[PDB]
Amino acid sequence: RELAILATAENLLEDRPLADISVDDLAKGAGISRPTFYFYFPSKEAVLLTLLDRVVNQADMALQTLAENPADTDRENMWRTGINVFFETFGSHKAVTRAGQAARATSVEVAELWSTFMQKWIAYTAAVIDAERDRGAAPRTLPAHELATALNLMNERTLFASFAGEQPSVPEARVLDTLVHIWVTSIYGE
Amino acid sequence: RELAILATAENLLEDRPLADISVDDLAKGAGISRPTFYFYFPSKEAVLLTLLDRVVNQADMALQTLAENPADTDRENMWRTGINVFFETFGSHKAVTRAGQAARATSVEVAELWSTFMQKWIAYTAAVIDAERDRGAAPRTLPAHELATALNLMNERTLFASFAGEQPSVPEARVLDTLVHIWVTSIYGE
Ligand SMILES: CC(C)N1CCC2(CC1)CC(=O)c1cc(-c3ccc(C(=O)NCc4ccccc4)cc3)ccc1O2
Numbered sequence: 001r002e003l004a005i006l007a008t009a010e011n012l013l014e015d016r017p018l019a020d021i022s023v024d025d026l027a028k029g030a031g032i033s034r035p036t037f038y039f040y041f042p043s044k045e046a047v048l049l050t051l052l053d054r055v056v057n058q059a060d061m062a063l064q065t066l067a068e069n070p071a072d073t074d075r076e077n078m079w080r081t082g083i084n085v086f087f088e089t090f091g092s093h094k095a096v097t098r099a100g101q102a103a104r105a106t107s108v109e110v111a112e113l114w115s116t117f118m119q120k121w122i123a124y125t126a127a128v129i130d131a132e133r134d135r136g137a138a139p140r141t142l143p144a145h146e147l148a149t150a151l152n153l154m155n156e157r158t159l160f161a162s163f164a165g166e167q168p169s170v171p172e173a174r175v176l177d178t179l180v181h182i183w184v185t186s187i188y189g190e
Numbered sequence: 191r192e193l194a195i196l197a198t199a200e201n202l203l204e205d206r207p208l209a210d211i212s213v214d215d216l217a218k219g220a221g222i223s224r225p226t227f228y229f230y231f232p233s234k235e236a237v238l239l240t241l242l243d244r245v246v247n248q249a250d251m252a253l254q255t256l257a258e259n260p261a262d263t264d265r266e267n268m269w270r271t272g273i274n275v276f277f278e279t280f281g282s283h284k285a286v287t288r289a290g291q292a293a294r295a296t297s298v299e300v301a302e303l304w305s306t307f308m309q310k311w312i313a314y315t316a317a318v319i320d321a322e323r324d325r326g327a328a329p330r331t332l333p334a335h336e337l338a339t340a341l342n343l344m345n346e347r348t349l350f351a352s353f354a355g356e357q358p359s360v361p362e363a364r365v366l367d368t369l370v371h372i373w374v375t376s377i378y379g380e
């Protein structure tokens with residue numbers, strides 16, 4: 001029933017925003033009463049928070065698997081494989097991504113959830129850039145953590161604008177090549 | 191009196207969000223009645239739209255002046271000078287920038303205003319990258335317009351996160367050097 005509320009909410013977010021979705025709409029869809037819904041979730045906001053949490057953790061766990069299982073290819077394809085975890089994971093959950101992003105303005109818990117994982121992904125990127133510099137593969141240019149921060153923020157804004165079909169945006173079919181180019185040139189360039 | 195409403199609103203946005211500012215608060219501050227306020231502006235939303243419009247046009251006009259008056263320095267400093275128009279202009283109007291950005295979620299007019307200028311600044315960046323490639327200064331890598339789009343979206347997200355003191359963010363004293371590095375390496379790198 002928890003899963004049916006989550007699936008119903010993800011389905012309804014494809015067609016319209018959270019503002020335009022009611023607890024009644026969510027309960028109706030999961031085959032339960034308004035009061036039974038409130039046993040599982042304090043609000044329609046708490047339902048989005050859970051969905052965004054699953055997407056963010058799915059992305060995180062897939063990046064952990066990648067880190068532990070290095071791909072055997074040139075650095076450019078190694079980087080593409082990694083940026084692709086975020087392209088595929090968030091790109092398979094566009095509605096939750098769109099509404100998760102809006103909800104950062106209004107929800108302290110969503111803002112904190114996003115803040116914690118971005119800190120984690122930036123720190124991993126900084127550690128990878130430092131390891132590439134120690135092994136002599138990348139030159140010592142910007143502070144690694146400041147470079148990693150800007151490249152992660154770029155990816156957040158650029159992936160999400162592509163997913164939303166925003167004007168302006170990189171066409172979704174071109175966004176992965178675009179971000180890999182900028183990571184590789186900015187990390188390895190003198 | 192229009193100017194006094196605008197100045198009052200900019201002042202009040204330093205201390206709290208638009209949601210927490212009333213028409214009465216804006217009228218009080220400009221030394222006028224609620225009804226006299228509504229002669230000048232249909233809403234507190236229309237007041238933000240005007241303020242964001244002044245900032246965006248101040249940025250645009252400063253970039254036009256730069257384009258017409260090339261700085262006489264190496265390419266790296268030419269690019270820094272340009273990114274600095276956005277750093278200084280939006281950085282001198284942090285509260286309007288912060289609330290202008292939030293208001294994109296809720297205001298079609300703010301979303302369209304932002305969309306028009308980003309299209310204009312991306313097109314200028316694409317034309318500059320193409321001119322650098324025609325003169326043999328930059329290699330033909332990514333489509334210029336897709337590169338320009340990603341670099342402009344990076345700058346929007348990275349400048350605004352710095353201004354807001356977001357976690358995570360590039361410290362404001364480091365953000366200009368960070369974006370110039372990534373523009374120069376991604377535009378001139380092979
Ligand atoms: C060549 C060798 C030295 N590398 C190859 C790559 C790897 C191991 C060592 C393995 C990997 O996969 C990898 C991945 C990231 C990464 C990618 C993208 C984001 C990213 O886009 N985050 C912003 C974001 C968040 C949420 C929504 C949208 C955007 C973050 C980190 C960094 C470093 C890596 O090292």
Ligand SMILES: CC(C)N1CCC2(CC1)CC(=O)c1cc(-c3ccc(C(=O)NCc4ccccc4)cc3)ccc1O2
Nearest residue numbers: 256265268269271272273276311315318342345346349
């Ligand atoms: C070396 C020679 C070939 N160039 C030198 C630079 C120049 C002439 C030719 C002159 C210039 O000043 C210049 C500036 C931009 C520019 C910079 C930043 C943004 C930018 O950050 N926009 C996103 C944004 C919007 C609003 C808030 C925050 C961020 C856009 C365009 C591009 C191209 C230029 O050509």
